[PDB]
């Protein structure tokens, strides 16, 4: 219709533009996607970005002297708003240039082809609600297990599963498997859906909801995942890839068990791992309620540390990748970890320590407990 003319609050505009730009493409092949769309209507400014795979949108309060749409460089706009003085922000489109005035600062940017800009994807209907902080936490706890190799794109994603009031996130890189479970609220508990979302895109998409708020997830069926919170809307294109059946990988019973303090164990693993060849292997020896960490060789230097542990079962000597180990430990978010071994050549179950592990006298075979989060790390062959 007409050229946009609007006055906005600095922090509102800088926040909106900042979050929206976080999703911008690094180097798009269609330069239009490198832009941010500003749409002024009635009493609101709609900032948005979209790259055919990820979408970010948000409406902020505004003083719309005149309505209109305009497409500007997202990079430059973000860098400008980031340095704008804490002053009212006037925006005025004129011809092929946009005027961004902030007190004494006066910027003039070139406009981009608004017509060539594609429409944002319509979010599906609300499928369920989750607390923003908890949702982000779960995504984080499982992301550590996801692969990072684009040649294997099926490992690069997070398996999101919905069945009634329960949600299950999973991720594996063929050597570790993280599975988190959490409750969520849904007005239609009959839904049973299972999607795969790129891990990184899912974490950055979780950023859509700030701590202290709620997030509404809307799953479509081309399929995409929508996230809504505090007026911010986000969409992530689903990853087309089959996810491994992970439930049978998890062991049913443990021949050995251990309970250690997460912090002290992490500190010790990081100490002893200094001498391992490129942080490749670390040896654990359990016996008589004492863990004996050892790593290295006589050619490079050896390290060894002894920590008191609550160990039960037949004594065990098993090796792990110190990195994968510390990665799992960092996600337990509990005071104490409980390990669950079978053989030195089979998976081990890292999980938060429960009440029943403290008093686990006997020799097993112990049954696999139930927990909201499990980190299943595959061990390394011992010389």
């Amino acid at each position: 219709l007409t050229d946009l003319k609007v006055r906005l609050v600095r922090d509102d505009f800088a926040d909106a533009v900042a979050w929206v730009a976080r999703s911008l493409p690094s180097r798009p092949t269609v330069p239009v996607l490198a832009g941010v769309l500003l749409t002024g209507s009635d009493d609101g400014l709609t900032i948005s970005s979209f790259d055919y795979e990820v979408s970010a949108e948000v409406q902020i309060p505004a003083e719309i002297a005149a309505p209109g749409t305009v497409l500007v460089s997202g990079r430059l706009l973000s860098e400008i708003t980031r340095a704008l003085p804490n002053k009212p922000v006037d925006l005025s489109v004129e011809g092929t240039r946009v005027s961004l005035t902030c007190g004494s600062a006066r910027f003039s940017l070139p406009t981009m082809a608004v017509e060539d800009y594609p429409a944002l994807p319509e979010l599906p209907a609300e499928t369920g609600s989750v607390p923003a902080d908890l949702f982000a936490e779960a995504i984080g706890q499982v992301a550590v297990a996801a692969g990072r190799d684009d040649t294997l794109p099926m490992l690069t994603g997070i398996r999101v599963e919905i069945s009634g009031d329960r949600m299950v996130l999973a991720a594996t890189d063929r050597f570790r498997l993280a599975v988190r479970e959490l409750t969520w609220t849904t007005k239609t508990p009959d839904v049973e859906a299972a999607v795969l979302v790129p891990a990184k895109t899912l974490a950055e998409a979780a950023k859509t909801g700030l701590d202290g708020s709620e997030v509404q997830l809307a799953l479509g069926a081309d399929g995409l995942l929508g996230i809504r919170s505090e007026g911010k809307r986000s969409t992530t294109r689903l990853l087309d890839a089959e996810f491994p059946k992970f439930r049978q990988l998890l062991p049913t019973e443990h021949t050995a068990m251990a309970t250690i303090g997460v912090g002290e164990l992490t500190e010790a693993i990081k100490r002893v791992a200094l001498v391992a060849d490129r942080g490749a292997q670390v040896r654990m020896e359990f016996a008589d309620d004492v863990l004996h960490l050892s790593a290295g060789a006589d050619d490079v230097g050896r390290a060894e540390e002894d920590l008191p542990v609550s160990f039960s079962g037949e004594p065990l000597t098993i090796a792990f990748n110190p990195g994968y180990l510390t990665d799992g430990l960092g996600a337990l978010h509990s005071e104490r970890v409980t390990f669950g071994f079978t053989t030195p050549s089979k998976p081990a179950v890292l999980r938060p320590a429960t009440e029943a592990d403290a008093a686990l006298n006997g020799n097993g075979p112990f049954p696999a407990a139930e927990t909201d989060y499990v980190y299943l790390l595959m061990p390394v062959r011992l010389p």
Binding site: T172, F175, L249, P347, M378, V380, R381
Partner: peptide, 6 residues
């Protein structure tokens, strides 16, 4: 390094 899948 052993593989989880088999």
């Amino acid at each position: 390094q052993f593989d989880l899948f088999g």
